[model samples]
Each structure stands twice: as structure tokens, then as C-alpha cells.
Target: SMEQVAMELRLTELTRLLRSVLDQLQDKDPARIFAQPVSLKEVPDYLDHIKHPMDFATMRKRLEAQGYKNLHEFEEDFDLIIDNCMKYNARDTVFYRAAVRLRDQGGVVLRQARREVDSIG
Candidate 1:
């Protein structure tokens, strides 16, 4: 019982760190394009090109629902949000450039979060 209690506590700590990372990414995306799922009507071929889609709102829901078991799982979704944009949009487009910026800036936030989570144990 004590071990289970400890595990839950660690998960709470990890969740908070991951939530902060998501918030930071949202802040960096001023246009808020990445804030929600891409509408299929707006981009007719978005789902066709990107098989695995992600967004900040979905990530927030998953985090609150305890869908992520660990930091690696959370990071995978984070990367997917950026990778999907890069894959679907043309290199010259604003969406592609925004993903590039997130890759660089969000990368720093993730690394720091990883270190902080690791140190928690």
C-alpha cells in the first residue's frame, strides 16, 4: 500500500511538470493554430498525410485524465504535434515555420522538464 501511494505521488509530480510544458508550448504559439485539432474541412488532406495527429488541447485532456503513464509517453505526443505540422504543411508555409520554432523552443522546455522530473526521484 505504501509503495502504491508513493507511485501515485510521483505521477502527480510528473503530471504537473508535463502540464507546464504544454502551457509553455501554447504560449509560444501566438496564432493558436496548434491549440486545437486541425479541422479536416479547412485542410481536406490533413488526415491523409499525417496519420498521428496531436494538439495542446488534446494533450491537456489526456494529462488530466491520467492517460500518460510516464514522461516518455508525454514527450511522444509533444513531438507528434510538431512533427505532424512539419509533415503536412509545405516548407515555405507559415505552419511549417511555426513547427520549426516549436521544435527549437519547446525542445529546451522539454529537456529542462525531463531533468526536473528525473531529479524528483
Candidate 2:
């Protein structure tokens, strides 16, 4: 049982490495880097069409993937990962702007979620 624990620890570390790969593959959520990725360029752009970014079907689809309740109850953990990718050199270059954008947009999205939740009530 003791040796099994050690094996599990090692395996967990190993799995953690590849799990990101798998998650990305499944979610297809890319990290932000220098000025934002081209695919996501359209994501923020849609904020103009609707009161919020999540109003866009694409953005809503992504958020709804995790079954989020809304803005007030939100935490942008995905944004943290995107920021961390650039912070830790896992992804992107001009990360300073990207990180700021991520935080700003994250806050906006969460705020929108809060509004949506309030409207429902």
C-alpha cells in the first residue's frame, strides 16, 4: 500500500503534464499571447454587438461548457491559466498586454454573468 502511494504520486505528476494537453484538445481553448490570438480576436470584437462578450454564441458556448451560473458568482480561472501560460513562458510573447486584457475581459464577463443572473431573478 505504501509503494502504491508512491507510484500514484509519480503517476499523478506525470498525468498532470499530459492532462493539460488533453484538456486543451477537448476544450480547444487556446492561450493568449502577444496582442491576442487571431481566433480569439473575434471573441472580444463581438462585445460591440452585444452588451457583453458572453452574449456572443461562441463566447457563451465556451462559458456554458463549465455550467457557470453567471458574472456575480464567477471566477475566471481559465483566464488565470492563459495569463500563467505567458507568465511562465508556456505560451505567448507580448504577454503584458495580453494579461491585462485577460483580466479586464474576465472582469467584464463575470460582471455580465452577474447581470444575467440578476435579470433572471
Candidate 3:
């Protein structure tokens, strides 16, 4: 159970890392970074699982092998992480810190994107 929960957190971190890379490359258009049909709604639920602290080299390798070639690939990996967490009883914190990390990152990215747009206008 702990193993599965830890793995989920690792994948969450991976997604966060990949998205940070996205933010850097897409600073001119944050909307393009998260331009899914329902990205706003989906992101909040993406990393909702409660995470245990520790590094996971093996899990990291496995995640990279999953072929995160695009947003959908990353999203799919996230979904699998969530599924593993569910199968391991991590549903207890479904409502806990639900928006903490996503909200902060989203705010900063949106603010930066807005400033660029505002400057052009």
C-alpha cells in the first residue's frame, strides 16, 4: 500500500516537472500549455492523492518509459498513478489539499501569461 502511494507521488512530481518545462517554453501563451477541452477542471483532480515523502528511482524510470510524448501521455500516466493509488486505498484524502499546488502554479503561470498579453495591448 505504501509502495503504491509513494509511486503516485513520484508520478505527480514528474508531471509537475514536465509542466514546469512547459511553462518555460510556453511562457508567451500559458493557455496553449493547458489548452485541453477541460484542463481547468482536470488539473485540480490530477494530483489529488496524498503523497508520502521519499525518492523513487525505480518508479521514475518506469514512468519515463511510459512515453510521455505529449500532454495526453502525461495525463495518461497521471491517470495510471491515480488508479494505482485507488487500488491501494489512497481515496481517503480525495478532498484534502485538493487545489493547493495546482492553484498556486496555475496562478503564477496565468499571471505571467496575462502580463505578456497586457504588455502587448
Q: Pick the candidate with the highest TM-score.
A: 1
Please name the candidate that would achieve the greatest lDDT relative to the true structure.
Answer: 1
Between candidates 1 and 3, the TM-score winner:
1
lDDT of each: 0.87, 0.41, 0.41
lDDT of 2 by residue, 18-64 (tens): 23322332233334242232244545553343332221233334444
Instruction: Summarize candidate 1's per-residue lDDT along 11-52 as a digit string, tens digits.
Output: 887788878877887888898878999988888887778899
The positional error of residue 51 in candidate 3, measured at the CA in angstroms, is 20
Candidate 1 clash total?
A: 0
Which pairs in model 2 have colliding backbones? 71-110, 71-113, 71-114, 72-114
RMSD of 1: 1.2
How does candidate 2 fare on TM-score?
A: 0.33
lDDT, candidate 3, equals 0.41
The parts of candidate 1 lying over 4 Å away from their true place are none
The TM-score values for the models, in the order shown, are 0.92, 0.33, 0.27
Candidate 1: 10-residue stretch with minimal lDDT: 13-22
- Rank all candidate structures by their TM-score, best first, as comma-separated numbers: 1, 2, 3
**What's the lDDT for residue 58 in model 3?**
27
Model 3 alpha-carbon miss at residue 102, Å: 8.7
How well does model 2 score by local distance difference test? 0.41
